[PDB]
Amino acid sequence: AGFIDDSTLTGGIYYWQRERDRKDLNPDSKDYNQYTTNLSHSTANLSLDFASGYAWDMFGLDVGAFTAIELAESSASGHPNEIAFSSKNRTYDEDYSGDKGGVSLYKAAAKFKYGPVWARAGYIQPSGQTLLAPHWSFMPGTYQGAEAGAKFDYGDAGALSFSYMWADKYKAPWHIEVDDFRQNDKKTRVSYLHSLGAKYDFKNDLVLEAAFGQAQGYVNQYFTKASYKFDVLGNPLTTSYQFYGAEDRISDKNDPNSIYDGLAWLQALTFGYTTGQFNWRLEGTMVKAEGNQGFFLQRMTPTYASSNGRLDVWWDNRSDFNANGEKAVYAGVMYDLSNWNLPGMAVGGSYVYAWDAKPSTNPIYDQSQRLKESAWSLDAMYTIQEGRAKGTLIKLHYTQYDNHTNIPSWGGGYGNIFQDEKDVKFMVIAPFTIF
Ligand SMILES: CC(=O)N[C@@H]1[C@@H](O)[C@H](O[C@@H]2O[C@H](CO)[C@@H](O[C@@H]3O[C@H](CO)[C@@H](O[C@@H]4O[C@H](CO)[C@@H](O[C@@H]5O[C@H](CO)[C@@H](O[C@@H]6O[C@H](CO)[C@@H](O)[C@H](O)[C@H]6NC(C)=O)[C@H](O)[C@H]5NC(C)=O)[C@H](O)[C@H]4NC(C)=O)[C@H](O)[C@H]3NC(C)=O)[C@H](O)[C@H]2NC(C)=O)[C@@H](CO)O[C@H]1O
Numbered sequence: 275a276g277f278i279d280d281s282t283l284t285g286g287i288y289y290w291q292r293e294r295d296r297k298d299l300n301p302d303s304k305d306y307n308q309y310t311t312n313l314s315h316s317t318a319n320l321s322l323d324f325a326s327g328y329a330w331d332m333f334g335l336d337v338g339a340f341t342a343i344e345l346a347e348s349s350a351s352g353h354p355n356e357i358a359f360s361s362k363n364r365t366y367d368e369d370y371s372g373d374k375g376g377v378s379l380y381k382a383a384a385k386f387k388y389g390p391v392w393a394r395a396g397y398i399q400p401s402g403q404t405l406l407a408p409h410w411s412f413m414p415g416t417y418q419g420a421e422a423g424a425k426f427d428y429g430d431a432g433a434l435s436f437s438y439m440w441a442d443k444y445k446a447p448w449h450i451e452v453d454d455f456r457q458n459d460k461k462t463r464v465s466y467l468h469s470l471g472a473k474y475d476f477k478n479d480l481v482l483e484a485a486f487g488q489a490q491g492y493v494n495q496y497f498t499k500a501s502y503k504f505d506v507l508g509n510p511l512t513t514s515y516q517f518y519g520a521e522d523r524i525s526d527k528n529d530p531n532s533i534y535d536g537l538a539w540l541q542a543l544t545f546g547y548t549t550g551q552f553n554w555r556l557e558g559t560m561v562k563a564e565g566n567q568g569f570f571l572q573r574m575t576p577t578y579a580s581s582n583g584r585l586d587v588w589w590d591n592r593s594d595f596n597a598n599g600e601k602a603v604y605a606g607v608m609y610d611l612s613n614w615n616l617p618g619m620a621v622g623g624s625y626v627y628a629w630d631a632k633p634s635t636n637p638i639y640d641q642s643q644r645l646k647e648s649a650w651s652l653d654a655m656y657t658i659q660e661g662r663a664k665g666t667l668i669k670l671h672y673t674q675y676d677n678h679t680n681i682p683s684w685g686g687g688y689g690n691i692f693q694d695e696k697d698v699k700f701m702v703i704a705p706f707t708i709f
């Protein structure tokens with residue numbers, strides 16, 4: 275009990291190797307219809323995290339920094355690769371010019387706790403029930419701001435948790451320095467992001483979550499979720515409905531800052547089931563995103579890396595499958611190899627089928643277009659059981675993504691869709707505790 279007596283000092287070694295090739299569909303290019311190198315780099319990260327206890331069981335603080343080391347990169351590797359640091363230090367300075375190593379302070383937070391109340395402030399990550407979230411590479415992004423919340427415990431009738439967060443700057447993992455928020459024009463200032471959100475846990479495997487947020491004078495964001503786990507033939511079958519919504523506050527549709535027409539939303543239905551050694555997943559999404567952007571974003575600032583928002587649907591099949599009008603169905607399976615006498619090992623695969631994808635409603639693009647995209651992935655995983663490298667995770671991920679058009683990447687009004695892609699990712703994560 276105390277500031278120093280409960281201190282933790284953990285860290286992690288991270289290694290990341292990647293090769294990603296993409297088809298060039300520009301007709302008068304020299305690589306026409308061939309795969310070209312897009313990302314190719316070896317990168318390592320090192321993190322160190324101090325987390326004090328609580329003095330008077332009320333006040334404490336956390337500090338944390340990480341380094342990034344570039345081990346190898348090709349001339350044709352695009353930038354930024356999001357593991358190393360971008361050569362430009364802030365969000366809205368990004369040139370897509372290069373990468374580099376260095377060191378970043380990603381955690382510097384005073385934390386408070388008394389009775390049913392808690393709070394954090396400084397350089398933080400969202401930790402409560404809001405729809406704000408950080409970008410995650412190996413390390414998370416960081417907001418400059420504060421978060422506070424409390425819990426209403428009703429005993430066995432459940433427990434309501436609510437939380438509010440506010441921030442005026444943000445920094446993605448691949449940036450060393452925080453920057454302000456701005457609109458789609460990357461000029462008009464956004465004073466703050468803030469969000470209120472809550473969760474009710476019935477303590478019978480039914481959970482209701484909801485949150486709304488705001489980018490000052492610009493965007494309004496919404497989130498709801500309902501998840502329930504019950505038995506079918508005596509096995510845990512997990513379920514969840516999800517809703518994500520967004521609006522803008524720009525009257526003029528032709529303004530470069532207007533990104534949505536009316537309410538843009540992403541709705542999702544998930545199913546999970548575990549029979550013996552097989553973990554099955556079956557999930558599907560539907561999107562509506564009328565307006566100039568043409569695709570739904572969970573983050574409230576539309577510029578790349580400016581901020582991030584909560585989104586519980588991740589299929590790790592490269593494409594975000596979030597185009598206006600797009601439907602997508604996902605099916606995966608991981609197979610535990612413990613009954614082959616390989617504990618800690620797992621192999622699995624994924625398949626995504628998407629259809630009915632329409633472009634931005636900006637009239638300069640053909641509104642008659644209908645795009646279909648699919649993908650499949652293979653995953654191998656291993657968590658070391660032996661002593662020395664106990665807990666070190668090894669993951670190999672391969673994905674083959676198919677765009678069923680000849681539209682060049684980012685064109686035709688599909689501002690967030692790219693052409694066919696091969697991707698292989700090799701990860702190693704080794705955590706360690708000093709004290
Ligand atoms: C503890 C720990 O270490 N890990 C835990 C981990 O298990 C989990 O965390 C998860 O980790 C993984 C990585 O490890 C995260 O993976 C990331 O996933 C996101 C999607 O959510 C990926 O984001 C996309 O990234 C690509 C870049 O590669 C973006 O592509 C760009 O998009 C824009 C369009 O929006 C393009 O702009 C266009 O640019 C062209 C230029 O030619 C121009 O013509 C146009 O004008 C312009 N259009 C505009 C401006 O509108 C841009 O060019 C393009 N560029 C490229 C090269 O593609 C894409 O937009 C991103 N999508 C979204 C959405 O952000 C991200 O790439 C991926 N990272 C990696 C390394 O693969 C994962 O997100 C993370 N989170 C989760 C929830 O899983 C969990 C476990 O609990 O947490 C940790 O604990």
Ligand SMILES: [Ca+2]
Nearest residue numbers: 676677678694
């Ligand atoms: Ca194709």
